[PDB]
Amino acid sequence: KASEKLLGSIDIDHTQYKFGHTKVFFKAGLLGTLEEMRDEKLAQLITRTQAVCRGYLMRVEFKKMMERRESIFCIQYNVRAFMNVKHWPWMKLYFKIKPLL
């Protein structure tokens, strides 16, 4: 089945090969095209690996640790929420109701 798929996607004529029981029979020329494409595809696969590694590594640390990053927005907004609610009575009540469950 692996040969059936491989021969089916590489566009080779049915005059140029035969399927057997243990071996596949090929005309001359054909395995040169496969070796050249194998070299080319391996080079294309290696650039994909290097690109995924750069995907992982191109974490801009200004998007995880700088001034106007997600976290400092959370600190500024939650601290701004805290300054309002540290005065309100029903904020203060629920904080001492629940230690008494």
Q: Which pairs with CB-CB distance under 8 Å and at least 24 residues apart come from 9-15? A: 10/34, 10/37
E strands of the chain, at which residues? Answer: 17-19, 24-26
Answer yes or no whether residue 70 interacts with another protein by CB under 8 A: yes
User: Among the candidate windows 2-10, 12-20, 24-32, which touches another protein by CB under 8 A?
Assistant: 24-32
| Closer of 19 and 68 to another protein (Cβ) | 68
Answer yes or no whether residue 60 interacts with another protein by CB under 8 A: yes
Dist. CA 52–CA 63, nearest whole Å: 19
Answer yes or no whether residue 3 interacts with another protein by CB under 8 A: no
Tell me phi and psi for residue 29, to 5 degrees: 95, -45
- Where on the chain is the footprint of another protein (CB under 8 A)? 28-32, 35-36, 39-40, 42-43, 45-60, 62-65, 67-86, 88-91, 93-101
